[PDB]
Design goal:
seven-stranded antiparallel beta sheet, globular, de novo protein, Designed immunogen, Specific Binding, RSV F protein, monomeric
Amino acid sequence: MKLVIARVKSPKVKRLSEEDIEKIKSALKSTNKAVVTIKDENGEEIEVEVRLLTLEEALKYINDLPISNDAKKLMSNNIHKALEPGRTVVFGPEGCEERDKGIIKTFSTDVKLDETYFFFRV
C-alpha cells in the first residue's frame, strides 16, 4: 500500500488538475522520487516535489520536512485518511482539507505552512 506525497512549492495552489495528477503518476513509474512542474491559473510555473512512499516511509518523510512541529502532528494524525481509495488530504497555509470522491471537510488551523501538500493513495 503506497501513498503519493505531492509537495507544491506555492502558497496559492488549492487543487491539482487530473492532467497534473497524470504528470505526477507518470513520473513515479521509473522512480519513487521525482520533480514535476505545474502551471498556476496565472500561467506561472510551480515546482512540485512528488514521492511514492509506504505509510512508514511517508511518516519518516513528514518528520524530515522543514516545517513546524504542529504541521508534522497535523500531517501524521491525518495521513491515514489518504489511504482510503478516492480520498485526498490537503495541507496548506489555510489548514487541512479532505476531498472525498470535490471537498467534504475543511478545518482551519495555522501551522505556519507556506506550501501545499497533497496526500492520495495510488
